[PDB]
Amino acid sequence: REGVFVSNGTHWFVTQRNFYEPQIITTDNTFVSGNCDVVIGIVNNTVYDPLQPE
Amino acid sequence: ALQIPFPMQMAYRFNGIGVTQNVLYENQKLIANQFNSAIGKIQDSLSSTP
Ligand SMILES: *[C@@H]1O[C@H](CO)[C@@H](O[C@@H]2O[C@H](CO)[C@@H](O)[C@H](O)[C@H]2NC(C)=O)[C@H](O)[C@H]1NC(C)=O
Ligand SMILES: *[C@@H]1O[C@H](CO)[C@@H](O)[C@H](O)[C@H]1NC(C)=O
Ligand SMILES: *[C@@H]1O[C@H](CO)[C@@H](O)[C@H](O)[C@H]1NC(C)=O
């Protein structure tokens, strides 16, 4: 939703575009759009659901 | 200077214009052709019109 995805080699994080403040990928800080096939450069990864433990 | 993939940079400009990033990635091929075609057209217009 804001910022870009980054990876330190193993994990994946989303951080603001002007300061390295990584955090876990969550459905709140991202938004779904369409299917995986259309976009190029997409990578496999899981998105944590905040209400999943609930 | 901060390196960044050019299609990703477009998403920044698209996001900074009022459209979501997805509209670019879902149309990256179309936009690229339009950009190249426009770049070709301006060259001809400059060459033709004195
Ligand atoms: C990338 O960052 C992740 C953040 O989770 C690192 O994973 C942690 O690494 C520390 C040591 O740096 C461990 O103590 C933690 O247990 C790890 N946590 C998880 C959830 O994996 C990961 O090591 C980093 N990868 C790098 C730096 O290559
Ligand atoms: C260019 O980007 C594509 C799509 O992410 C990737 O498959 C390819 O390996 C890249 N080329 C490089 C990194 O030289
Ligand atoms: C997971 O991995 C491959 C290779 O990264 C990717 O192309 C694919 O779309 C992903 N999903 C599945 C179900 O294979």
Experimental method, per PDB record:
cryo-EM
SS3 B2: coil
Give the Å distances, CA to CA, from B19 to A1, A27, A29, B12: 12, 20, 17, 10
Residues 6+ apart with CB under 8 A from B25: A38, A39, A40, B7, B11
Residue A33 with chain B: CB contacts under 8 Å: 20, 22, 26
CA distance A40 to B7: 10
Residue nearest to atom 5 of ligand 1 (CA): A11
CA distance A16 to A4: 7
Q: What is the resolution of this structure in A?
A: 3.2
Residue B26: burial class (beta carbons within 10 Å; 0-12, 13-18, 19+): middle
DSSP A2-54: -SEEE-SSSS-EEE-TTS---B--BTTT----S-TTTSSS------B-TTTT-
CA distance A5 to B4: 12
- When CB atoms are compared, the residue of A4, A31, A38 closest to B8 is A4
